[PDB]
């Protein structure tokens, strides 16, 4: 029971996702995309999970996204295929498309993987937190760097001036789809595999 | 970082394809066919791809065509089977049929593979560029020759009197189908596996 | 062609540098110094280079500075010797001297290497990006940290709140010189050896 | 003494090259470039060489370019450095620059090699003839392909409708330079290492 | 971290040296000479160096003298050769000549190494501090002794009645030259390789 004692937990949450009936450029093949990021706090705030944890540090070793259709949609009713892509930096925010795309916006990525609209998909990834760099050739701008291995660093749950360690955004997975003729609803389940370091007391009473 | 340094990229593009409801020779079995060819420029002009590449030469090692039904078509709704065939010369243009065929026009080909209309198909091939021969027994006519191995040659991206190296047409895959009782729409994804030779600057400023 | 697929490119740019005739403390030995830093954007904006790259992340493995005399300067015309030094943090900005130095301001550095003014120099180094630390004993001040191995991290090209990943400043090489009796002009060539991670599409259309 | 009997010859020619005094943008670093291509006829027409050869076919295994200063220019008078690049397709014609370049136009090439203006350079290469492709996605345009190995093909000296086999253009080497303060004249020597197949008679008398 | 803990540093300083145009005994060969000694304080006083060191003892293991021409002097311009000699006692003071020598005053020394006036020289040596002997056959006179190995002793930085440990003079290197037809200026760089013993606090406050 040393300072560096480690514990591993599995954490999950779910939510609904909708792909809307195509009402634009009807008759043409169009694509759109959305994305998911992972933060420990997103999971601790889910109703059935522990809302606080008594550990000093954490690191996310692995994340999982599974999206499967519901609402009575037929798995044998083909609606083409889109792609999933692992995008481990804040550029992923551009891949929630705000206009219709004439090509699959994710297919060109290295690591892009096909998925069929009518079956959903399942994918695991190593999501990355973004370390700050403030020394750029343009003054007062900043950029990011992330570490190749999760074993390199630890994130204090209550470190920093806001005690907001659990809100670090880890990137990330995006998914694209050809727009279908009818609306399709899905159940999405996210899973975190998180290591925690150092069991810790509550903050002192004041 | 020598003159002969090689890089390899994967490139993709997508489009919609329709097989129309049978409205001719109704009640009888008929077949039609279409085809696809591959040019690097086709892929670089696709919206999400780089539209120019800073390499001196290229060669297409492998191509992949995948066509899958969309528009709510049921995979368990059987509409017979047609064939794909690898046709590596410009004769393939005759296999976009302009009249109904009473037999499957591609089935006799060596290499012809069956595919079910309601499931689509996936096929990889080695598409071939066509070298010119102008010395024929008939005057003012030319013919073609293609090389067995992609490693034999290189196509300069900006070589030739038109600087149109990326537009060389590589042949090719055709697909046939028995005409269905209802229209079927598909999503088609093409993929190229391309080697590039010699990282290169932009053309000099003028 | 996985998420972690790596590509390696060599990139270069050039510019002119002048060491001015000595017009101060005439007859005495004085020294001055200047310095160079490395940012990917510096090289992509150079006219003959690709101005955007379709990769998700990068890291600079190695940099090279070569400065050689031009303008008819005689290599056999001895004008003494100064030093180069590898300075891998923003302290290097103090070594663009604004006053004449009575000693060589770089010679004391560990790693300082001699170079003859009339011949120029060539030096390779591992330039370092600067990670931010904001938790200091003095309020409202920040400091830097850099990683020993380039393999530890990745810089996303479009990551961070400014999408300015390519503008991260990597430090750095400084060079000093005894002031010569006549002006000397040089041609400087910088070279980067950069690994890129994950071929990527263009940003979606908006 | 069979049909496939081979003979190897070394062939050479020389000419003068001038790099002009900079008279534009004086005070700025600018670059220009030129290039050389290789054709057997260029060498057979040189005064001291045999103007016809009694062989049926040939192939160029190796070419060499050596350019060295003359006109009294001092090798110890430094005028910076440019680069040489092997460019084995007709794109090389763009690298005879018609406007001043702000960067070295050849340095980014894979295989680019530095050379000092005041010493000249020497470089060997495998120059390539350009095979015609007329089947492009744009009608009535053509492009090129070249073969990786010289051992793959033979060029008949008198083949084709013009009996102009010796005029096939083999590409190619380009060289760039920073513009110097005074004009520099050079002697350039080119060398071909050519294999010939099948000793042959003169054409019949008519 | 014991009493005997050793640290090793490299220290350097520079200065100008002139060999004057021959204005005496013109038309004849004459020689003059000068010398350098080494004291830690000489290097700590130099502007860019730390002016105090927090160590208890030191010893100089190795010294280096490098003198190279400047002022535009041509290296290919022959001005004869002189010699360097390692003179490890205070007799060296006699070898700053005050009258012209008709022979090279240092060439006879065992260890004398020639150097060309137009190229300068570089020499390493083990400089020696001088231990006092006061028991001589003549009253009120003293002499010197020095130790063969640097490992034999240690010099406390603040030892002795003047706390002037860093001012111990270590001998020494002399250089001779034939008097040239025109003045020649040089840049001289001296380097010390110093071991320090026992990291130490500041002197107590008073």
Numbering used by the authors:
A (entry chain E), B (entry chain B), C (entry chain B), D (entry chain E), E (entry chain D): 42 to 247
Please give me the paper's original passages concerning this structure.
The crystal structure of the second assembly identified in electron micrographs and infected tissue was resolved to 2.3 Å and comprised of sixty capsid molecules arranged as twelve pentamers. To determine the precise mechanism of DNA binding, we co-crystallized the BFDV-Cap protein in the presence of ssDNA labelled with AlexaFluor488 and AlexaFluor647. Crystals diffracting to 2.3 Å formed in the presence of labelled DNA were highly fluorescent, and displayed clear positive difference density corresponding to ssDNA. The capsid-DNA complex, modelled and refined to an R-factor/Free R-factor (R-work/Rfree) of 0.173 and 0.197, respectively, revealed an extensive array of electrostatic interactions with each ssDNA chain interacting with residues T49, R51, K102, L103, K105, K163, L165, Y234, Q236 of one Cap chain, K154, K155 of an adjacent chain within the pentamer, and F42, and R46 of an adjacent, inter-pentamer chain. That each ssDNA chain spans three Cap monomers, both within and across pentameric protomers is consistent with the increased stability observed in our assays. These DNA-binding residues are highly conserved in BFDV genomes. In total, 180 nucleotides are modelled on the interior surface of the capsid, and cryoEM data suggests that the remaining unmodelled ssDNA would occupy the interior of the virus capsid assembly, thus shielding the positively charged ARM domains. We found that in the presence of ssDNA, 60-mer particles were highly favoured with 10-mer complexes almost non-existent in electron micrographs. Once Cap is localized to the nucleus, the presence of the ssDNA viral genome favours the 60-mer assembly since the strong positively charged repulsive forces are neutralized by binding the ssDNA viral genome. Interestingly, the overall positive charge of the N-terminal Cap molecules in the 60-mer assembly (+1,960) is almost exactly equal to the ssDNA charge of the viral genome (∼2 kb ssDNA genome), creating a neutral and comparatively stable particle.
Here, we present three high-resolution X-ray crystallographic structures for distinct macromolecular assemblies of the capsid (Cap) protein from the beak and feather disease virus (BFDV), a circovirus infecting critically endangered parrots. These complexes include a 10 nm assembly, resolved at 2.0 Å and comprised of two face-to-face pentamers of the Cap molecules, and two 17 nm assemblies comprised of 60 Cap monomers in the absence and presence of ssDNA, determined to 2.5 and 2.3 Å resolution respectively in the same space group, arranged as 12 pentamers. Each Cap monomer was comprised of a canonical viral jelly roll built of two, four-stranded antiparallel β-sheets, with sheet one comprised of β-strands B, I, D, G, and the other sheet comprised of β-strands C, H, E, F.
